[PDB]
Design a protein around this ligand. Structure first.
Ligand code: HEM
Ligand code: HEM
Ligand SMILES: *[C@@H]1O[C@H](CO)[C@@H](O)[C@H](O)[C@H]1NC(C)=O
Ligand SMILES: *[C@@H]1O[C@H](CO)[C@@H](O)[C@H](O)[C@H]1NC(C)=O
Ligand SMILES: *[C@@H]1O[C@H](CO)[C@@H](O)[C@H](O)[C@H]1NC(C)=O
Ligand SMILES: *[C@@H]1O[C@H](CO)[C@@H](O)[C@H](O)[C@H]1NC(C)=O
Ligand SMILES: *[C@@H]1O[C@H](CO)[C@@H](O)[C@H](O)[C@H]1NC(C)=O
Ligand SMILES: *[C@@H]1O[C@H](CO)[C@@H](O)[C@H](O)[C@H]1NC(C)=O
Ligand SMILES: CCCCCCCCCCCCCC
Ligand SMILES: CCCCCCCCCCCCCC
Ligand SMILES: [Mg+2]
Ligand SMILES: [Mg+2]
Lengths: 240, 240
C-alpha cells in the first residue's frame, strides 16, 4: 500500500541532485524517488510516478529511456543529468531560462510569472491558458535567445509538460484538463505535493490515451508555427 | 579469465529472438547473452561484449541505451526489437536489405556478396575495402530504394559497424584495422565466434579511442555525401 503520510516533503540539501523537471524533483522531495536524486533507473521512475501521481508506465517508460541517455551510466541517472540541452531539455520552458542566456536547471520566479499570471479571473489553469503561456514563452525565446531551438519535437514535449501540470495537479478528473492555481503554483515553486492545501493523487490513471488529446489541443490553441531548422534530432549522450 | 569452452556455439531455436546485429546475435549464440535473446539490459550487453570481444563499456553504454528505445519495456529489449527502423537500424546495411524494399532483420547472402568479394587478392578485409563496400552498398540503396535515408548519423553508425567487424574479428592488434576474411565471413554468415578457425578474443581493449580514427578513415575513403534533409533524428520508441 502507498502511505502518503510516510512520504513527507523535505527540502533538498546542497548535495541532493535535482533537475529541470518539477515532476521528478517533487517525487524525490517526498522520497518516492531517492531523496539524494541519484542512481535512478527507469523502473524506479515508473514505480514512483505511479505511486505519487497515478501516472502510468506507457509515458514513463518512453520518457524515462530517453532521459537515461543524459548520463554516462549503464541504466541510471542523477536528476541533474536531465538538464542536458537537446535531449529532453529545451528552450521556452515554463519555469527555467534558456541555457544559452541563463540557468536551464533551477526554478526561476521571473520566468514563472507568465504561467502564474495566466487565466486571469479564474482559480484554475486550463488548456486555453496553457496554450497562451506556451505561445508567449516561445515568443520570449525568439526575441531574446540568438540560439533558440524550436522544432515539432520541442513543441510537442512542451505541450506534454503542460498536460502534465494540468493533469497530475488536478482537483477533479484529470480528463478535464484543468488544475487549481494554488496546487500548480506549489508544485513549481516548492516542488512539493500540495497535501496541506487539499491535493490528492488522481484516482484516474494518467496515460498516453488520456494525455494525447489534451497535448494536441494545447498545441492547436498555441498558434505554433515552424521558425527554422525543424529537425527533431535529440542529443544521444553527454560529451558529444 | 573467460572460459570459451563454457560458451559453446548453438544454433538459435525457433523461439529464440535474434536481431539485425551480428555482434549481439553471436554473443547470444554463445550464451554470453541469454540464448533466447530476451530480457537483455544494458549491463548485460556491457558484460557480454567485454567477456566475448573485449569491447569496453564506453561504446556499449552509449549504443546500448539507444538500443533500449526500441522496446516497450522499462530497461530491457529482445534482440529482434533492434530491427526498429530509424533508431539504430538503417538502410545500406552490409548483410541485411533496406526495410522499404525487403527484410531488414535476417542475414541475406545476396547482400553480403559485396562484402564477401571485397579486397580481392588478400586474405583480410581492411579499412580501404570496408570503405569501398560502404560506398557500393549506399549506391545500391540510392539506386533501388526511393525511401533511402542517408545522414551524417547513419553514415557514422555504418562506419562504426565496419570498424566493429575489422576489430572484434581481428587476428592480431585490433588497432591495425584488418581482419581475416575467414573469421569475418563466419561472424556474419553463422553468427559464430570462429574458434575452430583460429580466432581468439582480442587481448587489446576495443573502446572509442581505438575505434574513432578507424571510423573516421573509413568514412573519408568512402566518398560519402548526404541525401535529402540530412536530419539526424532517431525514432524514440516503437509504434510512433
Ligand atoms: C510523469 C511525471 C512527470 C511530471 C508530472 C513532469 C512534469 C514536468 C513539467 C511540468 C515540466 C516543465 C518544466 C518547465 O517547463 O519549466 C517538466 C520538464 C522536464 N521533465 Fe518532466 N515530468 C514528469 C516525468 C518526467 C520524466 C520521466 C522525465 C525523464 C526524461 C522528465 C524529464 C523532464 C525534463 C528533462 C524536463 C525539462 C524540459 C524543459 O523545460 O526544458 N520528466 N516535467
Ligand atoms: C558488441 C559489439 C558489437 C559488434 C561487434 C556489433 C557489430 C555489428 C555489425 C558488424 C553490424 C552491421 C550489420 C550489417 O550492416 O549488416 C551491426 C549492426 C547493428 N548493431 Fe551491432 N554490434 C555490436 C554492438 C551493438 C549494440 C550494443 C547495439 C545496440 C544495443 C547494436 C545494435 C545494432 C543494430 C541495430 C544494427 C543494425 C544496423 C543496420 O545494419 O541497419 N550493436 N552490429
Ligand atoms: C545503485 O543502486 C544499485 C541497485 O540498488 C546498487 O547495487 C548500487 O550499489 C548503487 N550505487 C550507488 C552509487 O549507490
Ligand atoms: C479556461 O478558463 C477561462 C476562464 O474561466 C475560460 O474563458 C476558458 O474558456 C477556459 N478554457 C477551457 C479550454 O476550458
Ligand atoms: C548562438 O548565436 C550567436 C549569434 O548568432 C552565434 O554567434 C553563436 O555561434 C551561436 N552559438 C551556438 C550555440 O550555435
Ligand atoms: C521481459 O520481456 C518480455 C517480452 O519478451 C516482457 O513481457 C517482460 O515484461 C520483460 N520483463 C522485464 C521487465 O525484463
Ligand atoms: C516512400 O516515399 C514516398 C514518397 O515520399 C511515400 O509516399 C511513401 O509513403 C514512403 N514510404 C514507403 C516505405 O514507401
Ligand atoms: C587493403 O589491402 C589491399 C590489398 O592487400 C591493399 O591494396 C590496401 O592498401 C590495403 N589498405 C589498407 C588501409 O591497409
Ligand atoms: C517529458 C516528455 C518526454 C516525451 C518524449 C517522447 C514523447 C513526445 C512525442 C512522441 C515521440 C516523438 C516523435 C513523434
Ligand atoms: C551500435 C553502434 C552505434 C550506435 C549508436 C551510436 C551513438 C551515436 C554515435 C556518436 C559517437 C559514437 C562513435 C563516434
Ligand atoms: Mg528548458
Ligand atoms: Mg539495416
Amino acid at each position: 500500500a502507498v502511505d502518503f503520510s510516510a512520504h513527507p516533503w523535505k527540502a533538498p540539501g546542497p548535495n541532493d541532485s535535482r533537475g529541470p523537471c518539477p515532476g521528478l524533483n517533487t517525487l524525490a522531495n517526498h522520497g518516492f524517488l531517492p531523496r539524494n536524486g541519484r542512481n535512478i533507473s527507469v523502473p524506479m521512475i515508473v514505480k514512483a510516478g505511479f505511486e505519487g501521481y497515478n501516472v502510468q508506465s506507457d509515458i514513463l517508460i518512453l520518457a524515462g529511456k530517453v532521459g537515461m541517455l543524459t548520463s554516462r551510466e549503464a541504466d541510471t541517472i542523477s536528476l541533474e543529468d536531465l538538464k542536458l540541452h537537446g535531449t529532453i531539455e529545451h528552450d521556452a520552458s515554463l519555469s527555467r531560462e534558456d541555457v544559452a542566456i541563463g540557468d536551464n536547471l533551477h526554478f526561476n520566479e521571473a520566468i514563472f510569472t507568465t504561467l502564474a499570471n495566466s487565466n486571469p479571473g479564474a482559480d484554475v489553469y486550463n488548456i486555453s491558458s496553457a496554450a497562451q503561456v506556451q505561445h508567449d514563452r516561445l515568443a520570449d525565446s525568439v526575441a531574446r535567445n540568438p540560439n533558440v531551438t524550436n522544432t515539432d519535437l520541442t513543441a510537442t514535449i512542451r505541450s506534454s509538460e503542460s498536460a502534465f501540470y494540468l493533469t497530475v495537479m488536478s482537483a477533479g478528473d484529470p480528463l478535464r484538463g484543468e488544475a487549481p492555481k494554488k496546487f500548480v503554483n506549489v508544485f513549481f515553486q516548492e516542488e512539493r505535493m500540495p497535501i496541506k492545501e487539499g491535493w490528492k493523487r488522481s484516482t484516474t490513471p494518467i496515460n498516453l490515451p488520456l494525455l494525447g488529446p489534451i497535448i494536441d489541443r494545447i498545441t492547436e490553441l498555441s498558434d505554433w508555427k515552424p521558425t527554422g531548422d525543424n529537425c527533431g534530432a535529440i542529443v544521444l549522450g553527454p560529451g558529444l
